[PDB]
Design a protein around this ligand. Structure first.
Ligand code: HEC
Ligand code: HEC
Lengths: 108, 108
């Protein structure tokens, strides 16, 4: 990969403080500003049921794995030019590892 | 002060991942490598019952408040030359704010 597991506890709080404003991760969780992420891993971009993605996202056709996810989390708009997610990015790889460990775990 | 409250959720996980290895915060919690911190705020250094502090700590006679605590957390050994706490420090003020918000809350 390029990714190393971290703290899921740590990732849970990153999520609550940086992602929850626009996303849910729970099965049967609702779309909000952003789409619900439950089952995102191993899925391609733009396929959450009932959500209005931008063309950019859809077209990017990213297969979502832990590695991809890390790259995206660094600077989303640079990864998907045109995306409407208004999140500047997580620069430290340690923060990303934690968050993805948590997402890995909660989105399943 | 100089301190700003932050996320207690965030601080809880900082604690678990950076402080728990040697300290407890709960009332009736045990001394471990480091002393139990319950009721540390407004208390001076070296007065946890049953703990073997170094001379440095004791002599420092710091009155523990949120501000002091932030300074100490930056680089403990620079704050208390001679201290045996083997913790290099939390460089980002945001991390410290979070942790202290949590300690503020859990140590009472
Ligand atoms: C609102 C200000 C957001 C925050 C904060 C975060 N995200 Fe986001 N996300 C948001 C939108 C509006 C969208 C859709 C973008 C589009 O162009 O259609 C997204 C998208 C994602 C995706 C892609 C989803 C998919 O392909 O199914 C992921 C993986 C994602 N968001 C994750 C994520 C995380 C982990 C965040 C916290 C660090 C985060 N986002 C912040 C809106 C917002
Ligand atoms: C073990 C490797 C430690 C870690 C990790 C942390 N602390 Fe610590 N702490 C440790 C010791 C051995 C001691 C006693 C030092 C001495 O010289 O006698 C301390 C002391 C403190 C204090 C001062 C306590 C008092 O005056 O009553 C505080 C406020 C404190 N420790 C807090 C603290 C926090 C919040 C930590 C995580 C960021 C942390 N310590 C890490 C050992 C260890």
């Amino acid at each position: 990969t390029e990714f190393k597991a971290g703290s899921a506890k740590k990732g849970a709080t990153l999520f609550k403080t940086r992602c929850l404003q626009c996303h849910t991760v729970d099965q049967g969780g609702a779309n909000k500003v952003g789409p619900n992420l439950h089952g995102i891993f191993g899925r391609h971009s733009g396929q959450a049921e009932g959500y209005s993605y931008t063309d950019a996202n859809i077209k990017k056709n990213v297969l979502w794995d832990e590695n991809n996810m890390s790259e995206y989390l660094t600077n989303p708009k640079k990864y998907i030019p045109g995306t409407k997610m208004a999140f500047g990015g997580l620069k430290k790889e340690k923060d990303r590892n934690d968050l993805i460990t948590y997402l890995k775990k909660a989105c399943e």
